[PDB]
């Protein structure tokens, strides 16, 4: 019905004559006293078609008057000028000749049909030697090579049935005598009982090539062609120029050189010349053909007088400039434009501002297209006087658009969805583009005279979908999680913070009023401290309203916000200080409860609310907004004095030069961090003079502090440099310096302090300007692998799933159950006894309040559906992802998870590899992640909880998701806090509080891993090396053990589960009181144990830690390279072995490079061997003996073998944790449902390990959507088939051979891809996205998913 898709083969020397018309015989393009483009040459109108439109050469058939003819007088066609675009020519090659992409194409292709030295196959094609070809009166046999100086007498008794000959002719002749009715069927019986390995690593390339030839229609003669097809002139557009010069460029001149060489080779054979001259001209012809094909690649390039190479045919394809990337997957576009961004604070959220003459330009098709349709001009010709004039009649013609028309807008490079959105015109002055302030955040708009772009949609369908799918009001949220990014923006939120801050004296220390006009009555402030009873409401999930009422302690600005707040959520939410730290969560709560329109209005109307009051804050930066601690004087009498003796201790003989560097840099860090404590008292409270009648020691109104507590743009690392000490820096090598900046920006910077910190600034800004490429190129290659995951289906029957957990690094709660579970789905009937014995069935959509009922029972593991647990062909099933995060709903059938997930990783990686590194002129950290503190009178409610009392003095929590509610005197909750496992409580249940009052604490880098019970310490589900490795210190002798899990283990114990324990006077578990079960305390890796077996301890005492430098949405950080092989999935190229056999270890069978270790089990009778690298460090020699894989050397565990030795859900549970927890340390909480995409698409392939009678082979890794042919007929007709599985092919391998292969050609390494597409004669099915981009179709997502359903009922009729 529609034309389906596309198929491939190669240009057979015969079949070219079904597409072409003769020798393109001569180099020229004109003839002196006649333009008539050369009769028989590069512009041969007899081969390519007419010149001017319809025009043949020599006369009689020109203008639209004549067409469909051939002129007699010079024998030339009469069609149209554009027929020169596809009426192909040819050139008969006077030798069998190569084609570069079958020879220079490593792995290459010609060798895979001959199994003979690829080094020198090229010389046989350069016609340098002979080979035996055919016979039955044989004496020599086939593929025997020769020179030429012997042949003679035997032809009188044998010379009826044998032959041998030279070069390319002999290779192309041998390729006639194979038999595919007998070769391919016999190439497969090794697979019964006997097949080998390196011969398989080579020859399976041939076996796949030959089977692929049989199954696709290919022929081996097409390696060694005898005809060059000729690029149609209109693709290299031959024309003259007004300057008496011609379009002779590159893709014309390369054919002149080939034509000349071939016309010599012809004449030399036509005359039977000296064969020297023929041999040289064959070599020169192949040189010119292969340079015309892919110039440079043949170890040389063809050039012209301005030194440059000429553009090849392959430079339309192979690298960056090729059609795929420059003219198809992106292209130049009409009805468009660009200009400099400008802030538009009176645009409503659905709108954008556009200059009148830009609206005129972008809307010309509506004007030169409606004057002739109303009579509002006499003609389109006369209308030049009226349209360019911007005359009145243009503007009815444009309201008829504007009044309901969605303009599209663009902030390239579009690494993430929100870089493109849709709006509505507003006419303006000027030459700029005016941009609504809430989307300026979603775009990352950077107002240094950078730009945005504009696109007009003109079909009724594009305008329908732009309002429905791309509109700002209709895509508000972060696709990675679901906070708004179309959001109250840069200074808007200082206005909202200012309206929601309060003061002492305050022009109203307690005071109230309505009426903005009372800012003109004499005594008011937005910081004046209102109090009011406000009755307040809260919408239930059923739609009713939970009415409430409360006394408040508030301000005029907090009260004005009850005009703006959607009053179906309660006033008490505004009773705070609405910096960027807080304001998003009001809109988020509205999105969770009320509805879309209410949440849009609440986001939009906050914008102008910010602009009415942001200025009136008077917040600044200035010379006394820069206060300094006086008591810095006393601190300089400590730190510089500590250094002063320590630099003597070196010279008097009590330190070397080296420890002395640390032992002074650490003191410069301690000087900065000492001054940083005094700095905060002076910046935030130091009004000392001694009350009564004095000493307003209030919480400060310093602007630089307010720029950080509003979250407007400030940080502790800015404040240190602006109020106490700039501190320390890196050198260009990255490491710290003994040369501090003890001053700050008000004290000043001397020449040296500037100059040294400028080196760190240069390094950081140069990495900012370069290391983006190490993320953007990777993002481009990622989408080719990621695309096909359109939400197509519903449950996929996959009754299995990943045991996900909160991020509990053994000894922290870095992510609670909520954030990771966020609108995923269960895969088991999960139940945990503890406080409410909750049960959450399989197939339940885990929106947040399912997690609340699980977190009360301190749920720490949940089996869930996964984007990897998804059987669905190309697309995916709704249960595997559950809820979208940007539009915010149960994920729409049509939503493209694939590209969304790639963008959700490529943007934040490339973004923060800039947004942290442009700071390298100074360094510091500061934290508070160690305590919980109450703020008013109330009572304590422990919750989500177990907890115990300790002989060593403590009260301690013993549950993973614990909470500490604060209650009033009557029963109202007033606050709650999450509290780690092992957190020390300073309060009991039902106890009492007043405020200013610490209530829980833990280690600055750890929730201490702590006991319920008292007994001997023990280990379980643990083995030394194979799950844990050792550290040691002195002081008394001391110990610690690093835990190891998924980057670190030997084969013999891969999937162990390390777990500390408490036991009786000899043996086994001191069963956990009130939950009477084993006293065993499971961990991941990267935690560190700090007590051992045979030690004896109490309830509420500690066994393990983490060195957790917490990261966060702050301090900041940045990096990438250690992620790479988690998505390229190899082994380390150095196998620095960790041994697989316990204790008995030696060397004894050494060999001609690598070492050979010799090993035996401790109670066995059976020796084994290991090949340690040639020279590699060993940390052992004779006594240093361990279990199966401690630090004998240091080789980390290969990621591909985490699949091979633990299976798909296990490897997914660590790739979707290590890369995820880099982004969690960046504060970028991406939900796991995104990195599961890259793991699904390494798992794109499916191993097969024998032949059959369906989709089945050995040594193969088929696209999983095909190999399901197994279940599709085994269960219906029985058939015959083999073992099949799933793989971890890296992006550089998984992409090269997709079924959507039209997309894969754009991946780069485009010779490697297109040779496989040629070998497989490949035939697409249009099932990703990029394939329909390339063929200009509706893409198989959303509104074109809604069309692919029709094709799925052509491909299935009956």
């Amino acid at each position: 019905e529609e034309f389906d898709a596309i198929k491939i083969a190669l240009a057979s020397p015969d079949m070219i004559r079904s597409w072409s018309f003769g020798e393109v015989k001569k180099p020229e393009t004109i003839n002196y006293r006649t333009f008539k483009p050369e009769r028989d040459g590069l512009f041969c109108a007899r081969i390519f078609g007419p010149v001017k439109d319809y025009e043949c050469l020599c006369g009689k058939y020109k203008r639209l008057k004549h067409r469909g003819v051939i002129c007699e007088k010079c024998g030339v066609e009469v069609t149209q000028t554009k027929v020169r675009r596809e009426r192909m020519g040819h050139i008969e090659l006077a030798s069998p000749t190569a084609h570069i992409w079958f020879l220079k194409s490593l792995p290459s292709r010609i060798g895979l049909l001959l199994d003979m030295p690829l080094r020198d196959i090229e010389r046989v094609l350069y016609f340098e030697s002979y080979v035996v070809i055919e016979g039955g009166m044989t004496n020599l046999e086939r593929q025997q090579i020769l020179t030429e100086e012997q042949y003679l007498d035997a032809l009188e008794e044998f010379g009826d049935e044998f032959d041998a000959k030279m070069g390319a002719e002999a290779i192309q002749a041998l390729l006639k005598s194979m038999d595919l009715e007998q070769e391919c069927e016999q190439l497969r019986e090794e697979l019964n009982e006997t097949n080998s390995e390196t011969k398989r690593k080579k020859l399976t390339k041939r076996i796949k090539l030959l089977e692929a030839f049989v199954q696709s229609g290919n022929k081996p003669e097409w390696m060694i062609l005898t005809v060059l097809p000729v690029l149609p002139p209109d693709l290299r557009p031959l024309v003259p120029l007004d300057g008496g010069r011609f379009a002779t460029s590159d893709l014309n001149d390369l054919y002149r050189r080939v034509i000349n060489r071939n016309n010599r080779l012809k004449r030399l054979l036509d005359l039977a010349a000296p064969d020297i001259i023929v041999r040289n001209e064959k070599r020169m012809l192949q040189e010119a053909v292969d340079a015309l094909l892919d110039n440079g690649r043949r170890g040389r390039a063809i050039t012209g007088s301005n030194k440059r190479p000429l553009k090849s045919l392959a430079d339309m394809i192979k690298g960056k400039q090729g059609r795929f990337r420059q003219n198809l997957l992106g292209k130049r576009v009409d009805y468009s434009g660009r200009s400099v961004i400008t802030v538009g604070p009176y645009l409503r959220l659905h709108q954008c501002g556009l200059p009148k003459k830009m609206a005129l330009e972008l809307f010309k098709p509506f004007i030169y297209g409606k004057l002739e349709l109303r009579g509002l001009a006499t003609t389109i010709k006369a209308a030049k006087k009226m349209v360019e004039r911007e005359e009145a009649v243009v503007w009815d013609i444009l309201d008829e658009v504007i009044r309901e028309h969605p303009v599209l807008l663009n902030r390239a490079p579009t690494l993430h969805r929100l870089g493109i959105q849709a709006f509505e015109p507003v006419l303006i002055e000027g030459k700029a583009i005016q941009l609504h302030p809430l989307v300026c955040a979603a775009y990352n708009a950077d107002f240094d005279g950078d730009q945005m772009a504009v696109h007009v949609p003109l079909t009724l369908e594009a305008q329908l979908e732009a309002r429905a799918l791309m509109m700002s009001t209709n895509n508000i949220l972060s696709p990675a999680n679901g906070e708004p990014i179309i959001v109250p923006s840069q200074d808007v939120v200082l206005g909202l913070y200012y309206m929601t801050r309060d003061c002492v004296n305050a022009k109203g220390m307690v005071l109230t009023g309505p009426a903005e006009r009372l800012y003109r009555s004499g005594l008011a402030s937005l910081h004046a401290r209102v109090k009011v009873r406000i009755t307040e409401y809260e919408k239930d999930a059923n739609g009713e309203l939970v009415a409430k009422t409360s006394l408040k302690d508030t301000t005029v600005g907090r009260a004005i916000l009850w005009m703006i707040v959607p009053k179906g959520l309660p006033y008490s939410i505004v009773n705070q200080a609405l910096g960027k730290k807080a304001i998003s969560k009001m809109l988020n709560t509205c999105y969770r409860i009320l509805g879309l329109k209410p949440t849009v209005i609440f986001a939009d109307q906050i914008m102008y609310t910010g602009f009415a009051y942001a200025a009136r804050s008077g917040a600044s930066v200035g010379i006394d907004d820069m206060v300094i601690p006086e008591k810095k004087h006393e601190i300089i009498s400590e730190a510089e004095a500590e250094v002063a003796e320590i630099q003597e201790q070196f010279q008097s003989g009590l330190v070397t030069a080296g420890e002395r560097y640390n032992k002074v840099i650490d003191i410069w860090a301690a000087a900065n961090d000492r001054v940083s404590k005094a700095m905060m008292d002076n910046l935030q409270t130091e009004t000392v003079i001694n009350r009564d009648g004095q000493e307003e020691k209030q919480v400060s109104f310093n602007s630089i502090y307010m720029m950080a507590d509003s979250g407007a743009r400030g940080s502790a690392a800015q404040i240190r440099q602006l109020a106490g000490m700039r501190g320390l820096m890196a050198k260009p090598d990255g490491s710290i310096i003994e040369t501090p900046i003890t001053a700050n920006f008000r004290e000043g910077l001397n020449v040296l302090q500037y100059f040294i910190s400028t080196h760190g600034a240069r390094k950081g800004l140069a990495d900012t300007a370069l290391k983006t490429a190490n993320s953007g190129y990777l993002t481009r290659r990622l989408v080719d692998v990621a695309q096909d995951l359109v939400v197509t289906e519903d449950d996929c029957g996959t009754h299995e799933g990943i045991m996900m957990t909160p991020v509990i690094e053994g000894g922290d709660v870095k992510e609670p159950l909520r954030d990771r579970v966020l609108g995923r789905v269960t895969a088991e009937d999960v139940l945990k006894p503890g406080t409410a014995d909750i049960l959450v069935p399989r197939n339940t959509l885990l929106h947040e309040q399912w997690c609340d009922l699980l977190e009360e029972n301190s749920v720490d593991a949940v089996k869930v559906r996964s984007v990897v647990s998804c059987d669905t062909d190309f697309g995916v099933c709704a249960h595997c992802y559950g809820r979208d995060l940007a539009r915010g709903h149960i994920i729409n059938k049509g939503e493209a998870i694939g590209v969304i997930a790639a963008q959700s990783i490529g943007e934040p990686g490339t973004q923060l590899t800039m947004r942290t590194f442009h700071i390298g002129g100074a360094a510091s950290r500061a934290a508070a992640e160690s305590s919980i503190q109450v703020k008013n009178k109330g009572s304590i409610k422990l919750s989500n909880v177990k907890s115990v009392v300790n002989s060593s003095g403590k009260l301690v929590i013993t549950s993973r998701n614990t909470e500490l509610k604060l209650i009033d005197e009557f029963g109202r909750t007033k606050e709650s806090y999450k509290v780690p496992y092992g957190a020390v409580l300073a309060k009991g249940d039902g106890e009492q509080v007043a405020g200013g009052e610490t209530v829980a604490n833990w280690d600055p880098h750890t929730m201490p891993v702590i006991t319920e019970v008292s007994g001997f310490v023990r280990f379980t589900d643990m083995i030394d090396g194979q799950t844990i490795t050792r550290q040691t210190d002195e002081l008394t002798g001391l110990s610690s053990l690093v835990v190891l899990d998924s980057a670190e283990r030997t084969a013999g114990g891969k999937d162990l589960r390390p777990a500390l324990k408490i036991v009786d006077a000899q043996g086994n578990d001191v069963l956990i009181p009130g939950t009477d079960m084993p006293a065993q305390y499971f961990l991941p890796g990267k935690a560190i144990v700090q007590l051992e077996d045979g030690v004896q301890i109490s309830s509420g005492d500690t066994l393990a830690r983490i060195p957790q430098e917490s990261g966060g949405t702050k301090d900041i950080t940045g990096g990438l390279p250690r992620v790479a092989d988690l998505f390229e999935a190899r082994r380390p190229k150095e196998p620095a072995i960790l041994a697989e056999i316990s204790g008995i270890v030696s060397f004894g069978k050494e060999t001609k490079g690598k070492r050979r270790l010799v090993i035996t089990p401790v109670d066995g009778s059976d020796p084994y061997e290991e090949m340690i690298p040639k020279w590699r460090q060993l940390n052992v020699f004779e006594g240093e003996r361990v279990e199966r894989g401690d630090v004998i050397s240091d080789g980390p565990e290969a990621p591909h073998d985490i699949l091979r030795l633990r299976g798909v859900h296990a490897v997914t549970r660590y790739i979707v944790n290590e890369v995820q927890d880099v982004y969690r340390l960046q504060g970028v909480k991406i939900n796991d449902k995104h990195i599961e995409v890259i793991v699904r698409q390494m798992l794109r392939k499916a191993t097969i390990v024998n032949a059959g009678s369906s989709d089945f082979l050995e040594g193969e890794q088929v696209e999983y959507s095909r190999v399901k042919i197994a279940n599709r007929e085994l269960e219906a007709n029985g058939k015959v088939g083999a073992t099949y599985s799933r793989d971890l092919l890296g992006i550089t391998k998984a992409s090269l051979a997709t079924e959507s292969f039209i997309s894969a050609a754009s991946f780069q390494e485009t010779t490697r891809v297109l040779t496989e597409a040629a070998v497989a004669g490949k035939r697409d099915e249009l099932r990703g996205l990029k394939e329909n981009v390339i063929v200009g179709r509706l893409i198989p997502a959303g509104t074109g998913y809604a069309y692919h359903q029709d094709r799925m009922r052509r491909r299935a009729a009956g």
Binding site: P27, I30, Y32, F35, E149, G244, R257, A272, A273, I277
Partner: protein
């Protein structure tokens, strides 16, 4: 590389086995291949190895070949070529290929020319011997004097006698009476006493002596040789077919055809003897012989076409190719002998010109016309021949060849006369070039020089220069606009004054399919005279009002 070993071995007349490492081919490693390829190293170079001779040198004189004609003397191309450096240039491979010829100059290539002539001038002696060839030779002229009144046609482009060009018109006409007399006897006295039996051989020999002066233009010569090649293959196709039929029809392989045909070729006599042999194959002929007489009767029908017998074809048409084996070894070997002189001339011009390479290989084809017309019979040397002809074949190889554009050659290299002259301009006026100076340096007006420079640089869109206005395009593909300018002028020139509206259409083609002078127009104007013509111009002075063309001017634009 190889040349070192084979050359020093041939200079020595002897090569010891181990000297394969003293004069090593800087190429390859094939140590176990030696024990048979040593064979054709020894039949034309024999030596072996032992402690010491005392009086034993002579061995070569009873055990070796004698001409180095074409064998391991030239097929050694493969064994010197075989290691072209896998990525490195045509400007390397030619150095291995010239591993053949060193410097055969100053008398060796003159001996190649001596051996061209004992080729060509001895093929002449068998043109004089194959009785159809000496017939078609005179048929060349008897085709054209036969029509009672002629002067040119095949009388011109023929006769062409390199009698060291020492003739006149009547001695040129005598070429059709002298040789015709030697022919018309021999033509039938080949049947008197027998084909070459006594004086028939002397008659052939004296016809073959006079024909030594019939040394001719290379294609009038090669027409007669091609005629003898084709008339040989009239028999060789029949042998090639009938030998195949001995296998295919008869089951009687190769040697058994030769055993019976080659002593009574002419007829089914030897085929009926092939039946008479008996044996199961011959026994099968008793019910298929008809299908072989249906082919062998057209070997017989070649003697029946000519008065030949295969007895002549056995030797004469081989004596031809014994002359060709010299003539076309030498017209190959002469090109080979000069392949270095082609580089030293061509490489001058390869100086970025278009490429460092290709002009050498076009010189190697210019060398063909040079080797064909090598008049050493003037006295001069092939060095000077190359300095003229082969140099200008090298010039033209990128003058108009391989360009965008090409012109008659005077109008190509004249553009380069101007660039050659510019070497004064850029230092004598001497700051920038000026065409105004070039006018005195050429003694000519700039525009009649711009005759070339307006179009011969890369050609503006001049459709068929300006003549495209009157060519094949005058069909409705243009003239529909003429039938619009004519309409608009017919409108205005019919609203103008009741008298004046005729005149102001006459002489040049304005309004009628024959835009007449007086007779048919005055008879439609009446009263008076050549106002009939003057009013074609009167319009200049009271049709002065420029609005008078308001409906006329569109026909430059439609």
């Amino acid at each position: 590389q190889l040349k070192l070993l084979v050359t020093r071995g041939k200079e020595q007349g002897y090569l010891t086995y181990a000297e394969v490492n003293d004069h090593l081919p800087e190429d390859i490693v094939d140590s176990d291949q030696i024990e048979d390829i040593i064979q054709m190293i020894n039949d034309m170079g024999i030596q072996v190895m032992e402690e010491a001779p005392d009086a034993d040198d002579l061995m070569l004189a009873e055990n070796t070949a004698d001409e180095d004609a074409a064998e391991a003397a030239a097929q050694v191309l493969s064994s010197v070529e075989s290691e072209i450096g896998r990525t490195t240039d045509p400007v390397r491979m030619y150095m291995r290929e010239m591993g053949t010829v060193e410097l055969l100059t100053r008398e060796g290539e003159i001996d190649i020319a001596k051996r061209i002539e004992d080729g060509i001038n001895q093929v002449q002696c068998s043109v004089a011997e194959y009785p159809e060839a000496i017939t078609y030779l005179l048929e060349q002229y008897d085709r054209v004097e036969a029509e009672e009144a002629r002067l040119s046609d095949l009388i011109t482009g023929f006769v062409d006698p390199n009698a060291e060009n020492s003739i006149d018109p009547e001695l040129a006409r005598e070429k059709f009476a002298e040789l015709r007399a030697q022919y018309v006897v021999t033509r039938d006295t080949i049947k008197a006493k027998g084909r070459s039996h006594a004086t028939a051989q002397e008659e052939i020999l004296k016809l073959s002596e006079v024909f030594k002066q019939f040394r001719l233009v290379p294609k009038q010569f090669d027409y007669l040789v091609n005629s003898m090649r084709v008339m040989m293959d009239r028999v060789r196709t029949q042998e090639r077919l009938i030998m195949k039929l001995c296998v295919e029809q008869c089951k009687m392989p190769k040697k058994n055809f030769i055993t019976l045909f080659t002593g009574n070729e002419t007829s089914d006599t030897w085929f009926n003897a092939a039946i008479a042999m008996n044996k199961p194959w011959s026994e099968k002929l008793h019910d298929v012989s008809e299908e072989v007489h249906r082919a062998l009767q057209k070997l017989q029908q070649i003697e029946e076409e000519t008065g030949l017998t295969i007895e002549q074809v056995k030797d004469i048409n081989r004596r031809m190719s014994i002359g060709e084996a010299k003539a076309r070894r030498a017209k190959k070997e002469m090109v080979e002998a000069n392949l270095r002189l082609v580089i030293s001339i061509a490489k001058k011009y390869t100086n970025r010109g278009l490429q460092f390479l290709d002009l050498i290989q076009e010189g190697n084809i210019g060398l063909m016309k040079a080797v064909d017309k090598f008049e050493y019979r003037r006295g001069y040397k092939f060095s000077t021949y190359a300095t003229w002809w082969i140099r200008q074949a090298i010039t033209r190889s990128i003058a108009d060849q391989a360009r965008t554009i090409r012109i008659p050659v005077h109008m190509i290299e004249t553009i380069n006369k101007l660039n050659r002259i510019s070497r004064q301009m850029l230092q004598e006026m001497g700051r920038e070039p000026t065409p105004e100076e070039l006018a005195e340096r050429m003694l000519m007006p700039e525009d009649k020089i711009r005759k070339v420079l307006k179009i011969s640089m890369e050609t503006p869109i001049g459709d068929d220069e300006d003549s495209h206005l009157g060519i094949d395009f005058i069909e409705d593909t243009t003239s529909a606009t003429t039938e619009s300018l004519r309409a608009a002028t017919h409108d205005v020139l019919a609203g103008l004054t009741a008298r004046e509206a005729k005149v102001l259409r006459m002489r040049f083609g304005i309004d009628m399919n024959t835009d007449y002078t007086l007779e048919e127009v005055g008879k439609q104007f009446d009263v008076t005279r050549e106002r009939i013509r003057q009013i074609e111009a009167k319009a200049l002075r009271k049709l002065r009002h420029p609005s008078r063309s308001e409906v006329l001017r569109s026909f430059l634009d439609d």
